[PDB]
Amino acid sequence: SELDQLRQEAEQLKNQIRDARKACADATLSQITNNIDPVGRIQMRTRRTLRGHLAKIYAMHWGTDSRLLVSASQDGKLIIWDSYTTNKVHAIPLRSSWVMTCAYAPSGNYVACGGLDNICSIYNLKTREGNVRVSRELAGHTGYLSCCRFLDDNQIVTSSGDTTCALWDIETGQQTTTFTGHTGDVMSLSLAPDTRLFVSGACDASAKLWDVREGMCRQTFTGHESDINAICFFPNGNAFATGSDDATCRLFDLRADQELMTYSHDNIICGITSVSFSKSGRLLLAGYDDFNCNVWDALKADRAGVLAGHDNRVSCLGVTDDGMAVATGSWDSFLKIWN
Amino acid sequence: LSAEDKAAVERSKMIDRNLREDGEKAAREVKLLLLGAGESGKNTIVKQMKITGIVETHFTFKDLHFKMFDVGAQRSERKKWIHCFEGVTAIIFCVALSDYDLVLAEDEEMNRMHESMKLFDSICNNKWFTDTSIILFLNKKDLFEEKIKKSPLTICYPEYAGSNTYEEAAAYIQCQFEDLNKRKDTKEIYTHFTCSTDTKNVQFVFDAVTDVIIKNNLKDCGLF
């Protein structure tokens, strides 16, 4: 039938893509960066143990000033943290206590939360009322919200349980772009430093490079064996990292759209919940299910440290904009600042 | 510390005290998980214990604040949002006992009860529900008895369904669901034949929740 002919054409196109990637695979990052000086062991000590949450911390996000910090938990609380003095700036009680993601707006006036309620709720952090009031409930997704990042004060990008990512308008509650190209549950989305091409990973073991001005699956990234849980853009917007429950995390570039490096260890059999990059992109911190966060050398797939000191799984993790500190969160209701 | 720094510290202490009060209030409240295969009895059960995503419920029986999250409308991969309901005291698994003589009307090869059997097996043997008891409700007992009077149970279960009597058929099915609990020591499956007009299912949930609360208190103390 004609369905078989179209399937054959699709298979031929996939073969062409694979052949192009193989032809462009002249060398490997591991070979190219073997002569560089090893980074050495980076032992980090907890400087601030942010206590106060009373459930599993599902997500955190740093602010733009590298001091303010936002966290979410099953208790139903979004807490703004003054990481310098451990002072809780705000305590926002969520509508639904099933949050899986949170976001701090770059301007610093908005925080967004969402989860199993399928709504991305935006909270106004700066008001003459002297409190945090929900400003907009961005609804229309048919699946749980798993990652949401602000573009500006009036634009957010939302990756939901269903295969659909969304670009939203904060003011007018309509969805600007549909971002419909996945075949599974999409968990983690990243955002380029220039905010014109955001990458996202799903449960089809595939990561998608999306174009945000128009709406287009620019590139597709395969190689994982199970669902991609975490994603993070490189400091320069031409590479990104992915984490899956196959106990591996990989480096996917964009101008060659191939896997560059795979960061795996034999003793690691648990999955990865959160991944993040440091400034200069030498360190790839990843939060595993074996209760400790791991520091990987991005240029050389080799161990560089372990952020041990979390009782339960490391759910959320993030580096500051100035790179001064690493803030690591886990399911044991504790946020730790490593420096 | 400057005056503003001390005032910020005081604000943080107030926020901490509010968070502690809220956590204490929530710790004295019971989390239930309404999650079953068939949605026909789902609505009836949720409505009678009440009187686009996760729906909520809040009913107080005998000075016990209950919340029961019905998650049947998620229609997504369950392996990624079910670790959220790890602190749930009990999962109210409601299944249709009238699926006998029915073939799920969709697959036409596997019974609706047969599929719900694997759904239960997966839930009861899930990693996050190792110590979570399951309150099993077998709804549509009236339809089940009229169908068993119409025809014997052998059609749904050719492997020794038992006898044509409704009591024997229901007992055999209840055992065939109970024995799926491999961890027959940590948890305990609470089965209950509930009538459509019956109103004691809320009391049954309360009794099961009190028993599970006692069990968890026993584990929390050294007597376990």
């Epitope: 001091r67 303010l68 003054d82 002072n87 700036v89 705000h90 610093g108 003459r128 009322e129 002297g130 409190n131 | 400057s2 005056a3 503003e4 720094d5 001390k6 005032a7 910020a8 005081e10 604000r11 107030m14």
Partner: single-chain antibody
Framework: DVQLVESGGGLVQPGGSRKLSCSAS????????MHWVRQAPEKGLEWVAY????????YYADTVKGRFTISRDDPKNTLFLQMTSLRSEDTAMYYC??????????????WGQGTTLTVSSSDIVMTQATSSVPVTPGESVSISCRSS???????????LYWFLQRPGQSPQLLIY???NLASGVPDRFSGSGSGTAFTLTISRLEAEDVGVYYC?????????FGAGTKLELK
Amino acid sequence: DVQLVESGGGLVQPGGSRKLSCSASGFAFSSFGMHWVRQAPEKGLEWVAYISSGSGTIYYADTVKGRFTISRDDPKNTLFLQMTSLRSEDTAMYYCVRSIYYYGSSPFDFWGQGTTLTVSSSDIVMTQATSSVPVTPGESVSISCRSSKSLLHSNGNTYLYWFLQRPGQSPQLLIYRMSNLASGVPDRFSGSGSGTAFTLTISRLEAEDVGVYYCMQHLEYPLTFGAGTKLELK
């Protein structure tokens, strides 16, 4: 939306006792630290008391003492101020102030219209030696201020506040904590300044820029004001 109305006042017998009430609306009263600020009939402002959110810290001034008592009723959003003996120096234009304190807060954000009280017949000193300056439209004028102690704390910020008192109007916050602009204030009111002597910038002076400019330090709780700088439109 935010409104603060003062009640109680007028004429008092010597050694009298009257309570001043301030009912709030339009904002979260329980999350704001209430203040009381007096103003002599012809001289500048002066801080009176301060009650924090949650009634934790109750700090009074030195001129006023146990006679002056500040109370907060989170419910009903009422701020109170009672006195037990009214000396002749207590005749003043009392003002209420909302103050909220977190990392990037804007303390002394809002004020009130005030109430009239008339009688019947160490601390950092803010000098502001400049008294009157003739100002022309569009002319960029500068207002000076000097304290008796360095206001830059170890937290990397200084605790000098700037206020503008238009003729017949309640004081309004212009810049808080060394040139951070307030809410609803034209950007022409720039700040700039460092050390222990601090300057101001108005840039394109307009008709609304007329009035008297007041200083205040928030480093030590005595919270001393300074004599203002009237800007005569000439």
